[PDB]
Amino acid sequence: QNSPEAAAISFYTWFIQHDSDQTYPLSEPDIERYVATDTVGRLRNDYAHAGPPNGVDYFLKVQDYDSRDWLAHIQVQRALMLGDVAVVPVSFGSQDPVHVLVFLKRVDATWKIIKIDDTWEYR
Amino acid sequence: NSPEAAAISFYTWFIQHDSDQTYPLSEPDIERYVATDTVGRLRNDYAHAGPPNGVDYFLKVQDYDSRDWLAHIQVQRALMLGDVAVVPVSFGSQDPVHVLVFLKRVDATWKIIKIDDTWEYR
Amino acid sequence: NSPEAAAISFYTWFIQHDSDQTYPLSEPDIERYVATDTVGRLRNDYAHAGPPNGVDYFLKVQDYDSRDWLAHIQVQRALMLGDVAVVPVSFGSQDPVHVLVFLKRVDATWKIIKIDDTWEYR
Amino acid sequence: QNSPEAAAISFYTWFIQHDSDQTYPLSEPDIERYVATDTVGRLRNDYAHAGPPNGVDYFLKVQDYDSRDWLAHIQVQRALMLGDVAVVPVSFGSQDPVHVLVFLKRVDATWKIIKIDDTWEYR
Amino acid sequence: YKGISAANYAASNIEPNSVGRCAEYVRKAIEWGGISLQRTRSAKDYGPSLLAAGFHEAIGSPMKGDVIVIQPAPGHPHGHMAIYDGSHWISDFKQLHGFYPGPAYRSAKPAYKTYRYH
Amino acid sequence: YKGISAANYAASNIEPNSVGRCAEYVRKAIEWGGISLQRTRSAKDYGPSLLAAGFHEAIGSPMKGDVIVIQPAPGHPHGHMAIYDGSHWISDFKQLHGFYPGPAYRSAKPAYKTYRYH
C-alpha cells in the first residue's frame, strides 16, 4: 500500500530469504531498492573491515536466529512520523521478540531505509 | 509519571540550564532524568572526544534558539518496544528538530538510556 | 596483594573452572577479580555478539591445553601507567600465549578492567 | 640504538611534528617506515569513514594537545617483551600525562608499530 | 569412534551464545566420540589435525557428526568450526541459522571444508 | 562592534572539552561584541550569516576576533567554527593544537574560510 510499514515488511521478508549460508542481502544488488545508497556503501565498508557495527547484524540486531520462525513472525507497529522521516518499530520472532527501529525516507515514489536502531542503552 | 512526562521534564530542565556556566551533563541533577550508566558513559566520552558526531548529544544541534525551543517542546505518546519506551520529541516553532528518546523504568521513574537523531547512517 | 597476585589468582581460578558446566563469566565469583562495570559490559556483549574477535576474552584463544596452561602461568612485575597497573601474563610450556592485563585498585583490591592480546591491529 | 624504546621516541617526535593544521602523519608516506603496512591501511580506512576509533587520535589517544609541551615531554619506560612483541609505555606532557602502550614487532632490521593501546577500561 | 555420539555431546554441552571457544567445544565432543585430536589454538587451523586423526574431506549434503572448519571473516580472524547434529551445526553454541555462525561470515563467505570420519 | 571583545568573551566562557556546541559558543561571543548573527544549526552553514552581518572573507595570518568556519570531517558531519583570541582558536573549548579541533579534521583537511569584521 506504498506505506512505510509495507516497505518495512517487504524489506525484511526479502532480507531473511536472502540471508543464508550461500548469500547475504548486503551483497545483493537488490539491496539498493530498499536501503538508501550511502547507507549501503557505508555498511559494505563496515562489514568488509571491522565487520558489522556492535558485532551484530545491522538490520536484525542479532548474531543468530531461526530463519523460519522469524520469517513467520515479523510484526510492525504503525510508524511514528518525525518530519519527513518515518520510524517503524519491528518485532521478530514468536518468543522473546527482538525489537528494532526502522528509519525510512521518501526517495522518489518509494520509502528507503536510512538507518536501523536497536533498543540497547547508549554505547 | 509517564515516559512522556520524563522526556518533557528533562528537556525543560536542560534547555533552562543553557544560561548556566556549567554544562548540564556535569550537574548531578541530570541523574534525575538520565540513567546512571548512561550519565557515566556520556561524561566519559565528552571528556575524551567530545559528544558523538560533534553535536550536543541531547539536542542534536550545535546551535539553537533557546527561547523558541523552550516554548515549543512537543512530545508524542510513548511507543513501547518491550520494556524500552520510545518517545518522539520536537523542538521549535519553525522547522522543528526531531529526536527519539529511549527510556527505561528504574524503580518508579523513567530514565533516559539513549537519544537518537533522524539522520541517515552513511 | 599486588596487581600481579590478582592476575595469577584470577587465571588460576578461571582455568580451573574450565571443567564447570557454567562459563566462568556467568559465575558471580568472577567479580572478585574483574571490575563490576567490566563484568557487566562483557556479559552484555557475550550475550549479543559473543566475545570481541570471536575468541575467549580472557585467554585470547579458541582452544588450549587446560592442564599445561594451569601449570604454566607466568606473570611479570606490574608496570604502572598512572593509576592503571599493566601485568604481562604467559600461558603454557610451549609457544606461550601472552596477554596484557590492565587492573585498577578499587578499595584494597586490584581488579581487571581490560585484557589485550599482542596481535597487530589491521 | 635500534631498540624499541628508540623506535617509539623517534616515531612520536616525527609524528607530533607532522600533526598540524596543514598535514597529518597518517597521510604522510613516511608513516610506513614506523607503522606496519596493514595497520596503516586499516587506520586510513577507519579515519576516512567512521573516523578515528573511539573518536580520539589513534596514536596519541587525545583529541587536542599542546604540540610544544608534548614534543618536549615524551617519556618512555623500558619495553616489556611478550614473545617477539615489544610493549613500550609512553607518557606525554609535563602535567597530567597521557599514557599509551605501543606495540612493536621486528620487521627486517626495524621495529614497526603494530598497535597502540590506551589505558581506558574495556569498551 | 562414534561420530554420532560426538555430535550428541556437542548438542548437550552448548553455551547459550558464543563464548569464543568453538574449537575447544568441538574438540571435546570429538574426544567424547573416541578421538583425541592434536590441539591447535585457532579453529581455522584444525584441518591438518582432523586428517591426521583419520577424517577425510567431505563434499555434499551434511551427515550427523560432520565437522566444518571455516576460514576467518572480518572481526573474526581465527575462523570457526562446528559439528553437525543431524539438523543443526553445533559449535560452542547451537547454530540456528546455518554453518556460518554470524553475519560477518555470511557477508564475507570465507572458504570452508567439511570433514568426516570414514 | 568589537571583535576583540568577542574573542575575549569566548576565551572566558569555554568548556574543558568540546560539548558539541562550537557554533552557539562562537555566536554568543559575537553577540557579546555587538553583533547578533542570524542563527543556523550547524557550524558549516554559518558563512552566509556572517557576510550578512558585515563580515568579509579573510585570507592570510589570523588576527584576534577572526572567525573560522570549517566544512564537515568524518564522524563530524556538521562542521566546526571558532574565534581567534590572538594566539589560540576558541570554540566551545580552547583549542591547543590549531583551528582543526581534532584528528578527524587534520586527517581529512576539509575546506574552511576565515571571516573578519572590517
PDB file of all heavy atoms in Angstrom, chain D residues 94-108:
ATOM      1  N   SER D  94      53.837  17.591  30.306  1.00  0.00           N
ATOM      2  CA  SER D  94      54.543  17.925  31.539  1.00  0.00           C
ATOM      3  C   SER D  94      53.626  17.841  32.758  1.00  0.00           C
ATOM      4  O   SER D  94      54.098  17.673  33.881  1.00  0.00           O
ATOM      5  CB  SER D  94      55.196  19.304  31.444  1.00  0.00           C
ATOM      6  OG  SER D  94      54.241  20.333  31.611  1.00  0.00           O
ATOM      7  N   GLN D  95      52.321  17.948  32.531  1.00  0.00           N
ATOM      8  CA  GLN D  95      51.344  17.909  33.617  1.00  0.00           C
ATOM      9  C   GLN D  95      50.190  16.979  33.255  1.00  0.00           C
ATOM     10  O   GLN D  95      49.662  17.030  32.133  1.00  0.00           O
ATOM     11  CB  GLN D  95      50.806  19.315  33.913  1.00  0.00           C
ATOM     12  CG  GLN D  95      50.304  19.502  35.343  1.00  0.00           C
ATOM     13  CD  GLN D  95      51.437  19.688  36.338  1.00  0.00           C
ATOM     14  OE1 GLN D  95      52.533  20.113  35.971  1.00  0.00           O
ATOM     15  NE2 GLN D  95      51.180  19.367  37.604  1.00  0.00           N
ATOM     16  N   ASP D  96      49.793  16.146  34.212  1.00  0.00           N
ATOM     17  CA  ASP D  96      48.751  15.142  33.989  1.00  0.00           C
ATOM     18  C   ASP D  96      48.955  14.398  32.675  1.00  0.00           C
ATOM     19  O   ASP D  96      48.148  14.519  31.752  1.00  0.00           O
ATOM     20  CB  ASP D  96      47.360  15.774  34.062  1.00  0.00           C
ATOM     21  CG  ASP D  96      46.939  16.062  35.485  1.00  0.00           C
ATOM     22  OD1 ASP D  96      47.080  15.157  36.337  1.00  0.00           O
ATOM     23  OD2 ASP D  96      46.487  17.195  35.760  1.00  0.00           O
ATOM     24  N   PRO D  97      50.052  13.632  32.598  1.00  0.00           N
ATOM     25  CA  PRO D  97      50.491  12.955  31.377  1.00  0.00           C
ATOM     26  C   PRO D  97      49.458  11.956  30.843  1.00  0.00           C
ATOM     27  O   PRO D  97      48.742  11.292  31.600  1.00  0.00           O
ATOM     28  CB  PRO D  97      51.761  12.202  31.821  1.00  0.00           C
ATOM     29  CG  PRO D  97      52.153  12.803  33.127  1.00  0.00           C
ATOM     30  CD  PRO D  97      50.887  13.276  33.761  1.00  0.00           C
ATOM     31  N   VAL D  98      49.392  11.862  29.523  1.00  0.00           N
ATOM     32  CA  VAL D  98      48.582  10.856  28.878  1.00  0.00           C
ATOM     33  C   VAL D  98      49.465   9.619  28.707  1.00  0.00           C
ATOM     34  O   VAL D  98      50.638   9.726  28.329  1.00  0.00           O
ATOM     35  CB  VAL D  98      48.043  11.389  27.542  1.00  0.00           C
ATOM     36  CG1 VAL D  98      47.408  10.279  26.722  1.00  0.00           C
ATOM     37  CG2 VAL D  98      47.034  12.507  27.813  1.00  0.00           C
ATOM     38  N   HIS D  99      48.921   8.452  29.030  1.00  0.00           N
ATOM     39  CA  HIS D  99      49.690   7.212  28.940  1.00  0.00           C
ATOM     40  C   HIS D  99      49.178   6.326  27.801  1.00  0.00           C
ATOM     41  O   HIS D  99      47.973   6.049  27.722  1.00  0.00           O
ATOM     42  CB  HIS D  99      49.611   6.441  30.257  1.00  0.00           C
ATOM     43  CG  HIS D  99      50.111   7.206  31.442  1.00  0.00           C
ATOM     44  ND1 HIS D  99      51.454   7.396  31.695  1.00  0.00           N
ATOM     45  CD2 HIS D  99      49.449   7.802  32.463  1.00  0.00           C
ATOM     46  CE1 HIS D  99      51.597   8.094  32.807  1.00  0.00           C
ATOM     47  NE2 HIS D  99      50.395   8.358  33.291  1.00  0.00           N
ATOM     48  N   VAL D 100      50.085   5.890  26.920  1.00  0.00           N
ATOM     49  CA  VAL D 100      49.732   4.914  25.887  1.00  0.00           C
ATOM     50  C   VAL D 100      50.630   3.677  25.980  1.00  0.00           C
ATOM     51  O   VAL D 100      51.689   3.714  26.608  1.00  0.00           O
ATOM     52  CB  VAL D 100      49.841   5.498  24.462  1.00  0.00           C
ATOM     53  CG1 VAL D 100      49.034   6.786  24.330  1.00  0.00           C
ATOM     54  CG2 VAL D 100      51.289   5.738  24.110  1.00  0.00           C
ATOM     55  N   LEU D 101      50.196   2.586  25.357  1.00  0.00           N
ATOM     56  CA  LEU D 101      51.013   1.386  25.230  1.00  0.00           C
ATOM     57  C   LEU D 101      51.301   1.102  23.757  1.00  0.00           C
ATOM     58  O   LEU D 101      50.376   0.847  22.979  1.00  0.00           O
ATOM     59  CB  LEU D 101      50.292   0.196  25.828  1.00  0.00           C
ATOM     60  CG  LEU D 101      50.253   0.199  27.337  1.00  0.00           C
ATOM     61  CD1 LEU D 101      49.279  -0.845  27.798  1.00  0.00           C
ATOM     62  CD2 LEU D 101      51.652  -0.103  27.849  1.00  0.00           C
ATOM     63  N   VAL D 102      52.579   1.149  23.382  1.00  0.00           N
ATOM     64  CA  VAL D 102      52.967   0.986  21.985  1.00  0.00           C
ATOM     65  C   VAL D 102      53.419  -0.450  21.713  1.00  0.00           C
ATOM     66  O   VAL D 102      54.337  -0.948  22.357  1.00  0.00           O
ATOM     67  CB  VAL D 102      54.097   1.972  21.600  1.00  0.00           C
ATOM     68  CG1 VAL D 102      54.509   1.795  20.141  1.00  0.00           C
ATOM     69  CG2 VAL D 102      53.666   3.419  21.858  1.00  0.00           C
ATOM     70  N   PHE D 103      52.769  -1.115  20.767  1.00  0.00           N
ATOM     71  CA  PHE D 103      53.161  -2.465  20.380  1.00  0.00           C
ATOM     72  C   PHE D 103      54.042  -2.454  19.137  1.00  0.00           C
ATOM     73  O   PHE D 103      53.627  -1.951  18.085  1.00  0.00           O
ATOM     74  CB  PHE D 103      51.925  -3.310  20.074  1.00  0.00           C
ATOM     75  CG  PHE D 103      51.051  -3.598  21.284  1.00  0.00           C
ATOM     76  CD1 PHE D 103      50.267  -2.600  21.849  1.00  0.00           C
ATOM     77  CD2 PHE D 103      50.980  -4.875  21.822  1.00  0.00           C
ATOM     78  CE1 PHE D 103      49.461  -2.858  22.949  1.00  0.00           C
ATOM     79  CE2 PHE D 103      50.169  -5.136  22.931  1.00  0.00           C
ATOM     80  CZ  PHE D 103      49.408  -4.125  23.490  1.00  0.00           C
ATOM     81  N   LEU D 104      55.233  -3.049  19.243  1.00  0.00           N
ATOM     82  CA  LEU D 104      56.171  -3.114  18.117  1.00  0.00           C
ATOM     83  C   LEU D 104      56.608  -4.538  17.785  1.00  0.00           C
ATOM     84  O   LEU D 104      56.666  -5.409  18.662  1.00  0.00           O
ATOM     85  CB  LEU D 104      57.402  -2.244  18.384  1.00  0.00           C
ATOM     86  CG  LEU D 104      57.039  -0.786  18.684  1.00  0.00           C
ATOM     87  CD1 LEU D 104      57.042  -0.563  20.185  1.00  0.00           C
ATOM     88  CD2 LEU D 104      57.986   0.172  17.982  1.00  0.00           C
ATOM     89  N   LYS D 105      56.913  -4.766  16.510  1.00  0.00           N
ATOM     90  CA  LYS D 105      57.439  -6.044  16.042  1.00  0.00           C
ATOM     91  C   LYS D 105      58.677  -5.791  15.207  1.00  0.00           C
ATOM     92  O   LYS D 105      58.794  -4.735  14.570  1.00  0.00           O
ATOM     93  CB  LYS D 105      56.405  -6.754  15.179  1.00  0.00           C
ATOM     94  CG  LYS D 105      55.723  -7.913  15.846  1.00  0.00           C
ATOM     95  CD  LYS D 105      54.663  -8.508  14.927  1.00  0.00           C
ATOM     96  CE  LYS D 105      54.304  -9.921  15.347  1.00  0.00           C
ATOM     97  NZ  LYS D 105      55.511 -10.779  15.472  1.00  0.00           N
ATOM     98  N   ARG D 106      59.597  -6.750  15.210  1.00  0.00           N
ATOM     99  CA  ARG D 106      60.744  -6.708  14.306  1.00  0.00           C
ATOM    100  C   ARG D 106      60.324  -7.120  12.891  1.00  0.00           C
ATOM    101  O   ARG D 106      59.919  -8.265  12.658  1.00  0.00           O
ATOM    102  CB  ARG D 106      61.873  -7.619  14.800  1.00  0.00           C
ATOM    103  CG  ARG D 106      62.813  -6.984  15.819  1.00  0.00           C
ATOM    104  CD  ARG D 106      63.688  -5.895  15.199  1.00  0.00           C
ATOM    105  NE  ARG D 106      64.468  -6.380  14.062  1.00  0.00           N
ATOM    106  CZ  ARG D 106      65.703  -6.871  14.145  1.00  0.00           C
ATOM    107  NH1 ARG D 106      66.309  -6.948  15.321  1.00  0.00           N
ATOM    108  NH2 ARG D 106      66.333  -7.288  13.051  1.00  0.00           N
ATOM    109  N   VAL D 107      60.392  -6.164  11.966  1.00  0.00           N
ATOM    110  CA  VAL D 107      60.196  -6.412  10.540  1.00  0.00           C
ATOM    111  C   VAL D 107      61.491  -6.030   9.837  1.00  0.00           C
ATOM    112  O   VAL D 107      61.836  -4.846   9.770  1.00  0.00           O
ATOM    113  CB  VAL D 107      59.065  -5.547   9.959  1.00  0.00           C
ATOM    114  CG1 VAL D 107      58.867  -5.854   8.475  1.00  0.00           C
ATOM    115  CG2 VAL D 107      57.772  -5.753  10.731  1.00  0.00           C
ATOM    116  N   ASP D 108      62.197  -7.032   9.316  1.00  0.00           N
ATOM    117  CA  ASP D 108      63.562  -6.859   8.816  1.00  0.00           C
ATOM    118  C   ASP D 108      64.472  -6.420   9.960  1.00  0.00           C
ATOM    119  O   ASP D 108      64.548  -7.098  10.983  1.00  0.00           O
ATOM    120  CB  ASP D 108      63.619  -5.868   7.645  1.00  0.00           C
ATOM    121  CG  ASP D 108      62.610  -6.191   6.559  1.00  0.00           C
ATOM    122  OD1 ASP D 108      62.375  -7.392   6.298  1.00  0.00           O
ATOM    123  OD2 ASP D 108      62.045  -5.244   5.970  1.00  0.00           O
TER     124      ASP D 108
END
